[PDB]
Amino acid sequence: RDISTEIYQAGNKPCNGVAGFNCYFPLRSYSFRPTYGVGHQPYRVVVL
Amino acid sequence: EIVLTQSPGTLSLSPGERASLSCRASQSLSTYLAWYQQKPGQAPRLLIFGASSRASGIPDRFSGGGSGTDFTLTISRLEPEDFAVYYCQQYGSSPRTFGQGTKVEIKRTVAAPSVFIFPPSDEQLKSGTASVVCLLNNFYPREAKVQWKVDNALQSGNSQESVTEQDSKDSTYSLSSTLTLSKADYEKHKVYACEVTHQGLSSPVTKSFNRGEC
């Protein structure tokens, strides 16, 4: 399990802790709506 | 591969303030579509991502809209530079797919085409392959119909159609159609004719020549 929120570095230039070009927040918001298609629709998953 | 199509195959509009582009997808994309502008002779450039948020380095005039099945791209202000082929790509569901694309034409006064027919050269006849070239000059709209008639009989599938890009000075399109025949086949038919049907033309124009300049 990785919970790090450090800005990803995709460029030679130092990220600087600012999500500029070539620096993007690793976590991306996930969007769910009732109208959305079944594939997009959220599924609760538990693995034993 | 999700099936996606662009509602206008080609749109012709003047360089003013009106533009609209529509893409329809069989399966709902849940607001996950992008638009790309490809200039002729140039690599495609991202215009918008997600159909809601403008990409960096993209002018404010460009706008995106629509959700799920229906996606609409509208340009509030149009400039000559803007005209280009536009492709919408679906990335919501793997595999990613690209739309066929829509070219935005420049509106100009409708013009009847100029038809030129050239008989095959003697050197070409010596080679043994005879080609008849039909030339269309300064015809708008781009869409046109060329039919080859030999001895008053239509010919299909033996012709290749070549269209130049819209001319900058007068916004006009030129089309060349080539009919390829063997020397024996060319000898068999005395008369070669090409029928062109265009919006500008009041009636279809047929241009013909007799074999050996008869």
UniProtKB/Swiss-Prot annotation, chain A:
Disulfide bonds: C15-C23
Region (Disordered): 1-25
Effect of mutating F25S: In strain: Lambda/C.37, Omicron/BQ.1.1, Omicron/XBB.1.5, Omicron/EG.5.1
Superkingdom of origin organism: Viruses
Physiological role: Attaches the virion to the cell membrane by interacting with host receptor, initiating the infection. The major receptor is host ACE2. When S2/S2' has been cleaved, binding to the receptor triggers direct fusion at the cell membrane. When S2/S2' has not been cleaved, binding to the receptor results in internalization of the virus by endocytosis using host TFRC and GRM2 and leading to fusion of the virion membrane with the host endosomal membrane. Alternatively, may use NRP1/NRP2 and integrin as entry receptors.
Quaternary assembly: Binds to host ACE2. RBD also interacts with the N-linked glycan on 'Asn-90' of ACE2. Cleavage of S generates a polybasic C-terminal sequence on S1 that binds to host Neuropilin-1 (NRP1) and Neuropilin-2 (NRP2) receptors. Interacts with host integrin alpha-5/beta-1 (ITGA5:ITGB1) and with ACE2 in complex with integrin alpha-5/beta-1 (ITGA5:ITGB1). May interact via cytoplasmic c-terminus with M protein. May interact (via N-terminus) with host bilirubin and biliverdin, thereby preventing antibody binding to the SARS-CoV-2 spike NTD via an allosteric mechanism.
Name of this chain's protein: Spike protein S1
Originating species: Severe acute respiratory syndrome coronavirus 2
Gene that encodes the chain: S
Portion held of the full protein: 466 to 513 of 1273
